Amino acid sequence: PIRVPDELPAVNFLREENVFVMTTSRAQEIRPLKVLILNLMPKKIETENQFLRLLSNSPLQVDIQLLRIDSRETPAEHLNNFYCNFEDIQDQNFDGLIVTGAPLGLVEFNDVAYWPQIKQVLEWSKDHVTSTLFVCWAVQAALNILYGIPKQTRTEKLSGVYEHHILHPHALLTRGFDDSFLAPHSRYADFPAALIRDYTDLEILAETEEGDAYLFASKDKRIAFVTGHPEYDAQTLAQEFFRDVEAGLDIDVPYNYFPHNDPQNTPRASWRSHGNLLFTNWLNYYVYQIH
Amino acid sequence: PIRVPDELPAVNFLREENVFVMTTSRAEIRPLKVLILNLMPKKIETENQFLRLLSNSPLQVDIQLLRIDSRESRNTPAEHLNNFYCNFEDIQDQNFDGLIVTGAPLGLVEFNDVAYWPQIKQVLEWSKDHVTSTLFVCWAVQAALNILYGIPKQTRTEKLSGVYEHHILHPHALLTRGFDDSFLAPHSRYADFPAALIRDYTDLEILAETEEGDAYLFASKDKRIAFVTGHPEYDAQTLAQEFFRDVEAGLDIDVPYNYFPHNDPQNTPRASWRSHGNLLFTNWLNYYVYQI
Numbered sequence: 001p002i003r004v005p006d007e008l009p010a011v012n013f014l015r016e017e018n019v020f021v022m023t024t025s026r027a028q029e030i031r032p033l034k035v036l037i038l039n040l041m042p043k044k045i046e047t048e049n050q051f052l053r054l055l056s057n058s059p060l061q062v063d064i065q066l067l068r069i070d071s072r073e074t075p076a077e078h079l080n081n082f083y084c085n086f087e088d089i090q091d092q093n094f095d096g097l098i099v100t101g102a103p104l105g106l107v108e109f110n111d112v113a114y115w116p117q118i119k120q121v122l123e124w125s126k127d128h129v130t131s132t133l134f135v136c137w138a139v140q141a142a143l144n145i146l147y148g149i150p151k152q153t154r155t156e157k158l159s160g161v162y163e164h165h166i167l168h169p170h171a172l173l174t175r176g177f178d179d180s181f182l183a184p185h186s187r188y189a190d191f192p193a194a195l196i197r198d199y200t201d202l203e204i205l206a207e208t209e210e211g212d213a214y215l216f217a218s219k220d221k222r223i224a225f226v227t228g229h230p231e232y233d234a235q236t237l238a239q240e241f242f243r244d245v246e247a248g249l250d251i252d253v254p255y256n257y258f259p260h261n262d263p264q265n266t267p268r269a270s271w272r273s274h275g276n277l278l279f280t281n282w283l284n285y286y287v288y289q290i291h
Numbered sequence: 292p293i294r295v296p297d298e299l300p301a302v303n304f305l306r307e308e309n310v311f312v313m314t315t316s317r318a319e320i321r322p323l324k325v326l327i328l329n330l331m332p333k334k335i336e337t338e339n340q341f342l343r344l345l346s347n348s349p350l351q352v353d354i355q356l357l358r359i360d361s362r363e364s365r366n367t368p369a370e371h372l373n374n375f376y377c378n379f380e381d382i383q384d385q386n387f388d389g390l391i392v393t394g395a396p397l398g399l400v401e402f403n404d405v406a407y408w409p410q411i412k413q414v415l416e417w418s419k420d421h422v423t424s425t426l427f428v429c430w431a432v433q434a435a436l437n438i439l440y441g442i443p444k445q446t447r448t449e450k451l452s453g454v455y456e457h458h459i460l461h462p463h464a465l466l467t468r469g470f471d472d473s474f475l476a477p478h479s480r481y482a483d484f485p486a487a488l489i490r491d492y493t494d495l496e497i498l499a500e501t502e503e504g505d506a507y508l509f510a511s512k513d514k515r516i517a518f519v520t521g522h523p524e525y526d527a528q529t530l531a532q533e534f535f536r537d538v539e540a541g542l543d544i545d546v547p548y549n550y551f552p553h554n555d556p557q558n559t560p561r562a563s564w565r566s567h568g569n570l571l572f573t574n575w576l577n578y579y580v581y582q583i
Contacts, residue, residue: 276469
């Protein structure tokens with residue numbers, strides 16, 4: 001935050017925009033943050049690189065620990081070298097937790113082999129984690145475990161780069177977001193905004209144009225949710241599309257993804273900026289809290 | 292930055308993307324000093340727009356505001372300036388991490404006719420030894436290219452006024468970190484900044500251009516100096532306020548380009564450039580003003 005003379009007009013002006021300002025008449029402790037990533041995605045290293053790229057964009061030091069949900073056999077070397085089990089970290093507190101997506105869009109919760117382990121991490125997070133960010137399927141899991149919302153599935157997979165808008169001009173998690181912006185989705189989970197409004201107390205910060213919640217969070221910042229995959233690389237949707245075409249599914253192209261909707265053309269990461277802002281804002285205002 | 296075990300694949304992978312990674316070798320974060328030489332005619336609006344952006348960082352940024360003009364040059368006191376601003380002699384023996392020189396209403400004035408040209412030269416010479424990273428905005432770009440590279444002033448045949456399309460040149464650069472491949476930013480200038488001018492008469496790296504061929508962002512490889520030719524700090528309504536004053540003052544002018552919805556000045560304009568203004572100023576603080 002800036003530190004300026006108490007009566008500079010910027011002080012009252014920026015405070016009215018929900019911006020914290022320091023004044024020369026008053027005065028912080030800025031220590032390394034501890035962030036845990038529960039990696040449920042099957043391509044473990046690709047997912048590590050995607051999230052760690054975006055967790056790199058703060059001047060704050062982010063000490064990262066990687067959490068595995070069970071010990072099912074990614075190289076076994078990789079997990080044994082770099083990941084911890086829940087019993088290894090259960091006595092620790094963290095500033096942040098990310099629960100990634102998982103390929104569980106079409107699996108009932110009672111058929112998810114590690115469902116008990118997921119309930120145990122989410123219950124523990126309430127007292128042990130300052131802010132937990134749930135991504136994609138983890139949003140569906142958390143809506144079920146924290147609010148008793150039953151699984152809801154779309155008619156077809158939402159796959160593409162979609163238009164969104166922010167709802168709160170002065171919010172922290174969307175600080176610097178354009179009024180409308182692009183972010184990618186790849187999900188069977190259905191997240192209509194009305195479901196979040198009618199069955200939770202969460203504040204909705206951004207929606208898709210079609211009426212889905214994209215970003216929402218608790219007022220105390222303990223829990224935050226993102227229903228897209230802003231961490232995806234340019235090619236990530238294309239890899240899923242080509243694997244489904246090879247299997248004989250012969251699906252549509254992802255929306256607004258390939259140039260001219262022709263999969264011979266190279267897709268670009270048209271969603272980069274607001275993925276960077278999102279993770280930078282989550283570290284700077286949710287994981288780190290000046291107050 | 293993240294701190295992970297040295298052998299994690301992310302380490303070599305993000306280093307190949309020009310991203311600094313700490314590895315689990317030894318884990319004290321200091322306040323930054325930034326000076327703003329405010330040359331804009333709306334001093335308080337300008338302070339609010341740049342301070343909004345410098346506020347979006349966990350780093351503590353101690354701000355001092357610098358005036359170019361003496362207290363006695365004015366027919367009446369400038370209350371605001373007297374209360375909040377220092378003069379050069381007050382800060383000449385201090386060191387700063389950052390300096391911003393704003394734009395100035397001097398696009399049609401020859402440097403030798405600019406009344407405070409000596410004072411501007413004195414600040415720029417001082418900044419070489421006293422400021423880790425200087426950001427020049429709009430006219431200050433022309434001033435700096437003159438003093439540092441001997442480039443004469445160039446003026447466009449027609450004023451640029453609107454929100455224009457841009458692209459980045461360096462996928463892994465620090466100052467454009469997180470920028471989309473193409474993005475919007477406002478311009479409002481007669482100053483002419485063809486990219487060929489920067490390539491052919493300086494050693495500066497060009498990081499982004501307008502679609503019509505102007506340099507928008509460029510910097511030195513040592514990060515001592517950085518240049519922006521547009522106004523991503525502008526509020527939604529800044530171009531609108533100027534447009535309505537021009538209309539009221541009797542000028543026959545088009546709306547600013549790509550600014551009002553449907554090009555209709557009854558429509559509320561949106562700050563369509565907000566995101567890349569935030570990335571720019573956040574990246575400037577984090578990688579240029581703060582280094583280690």
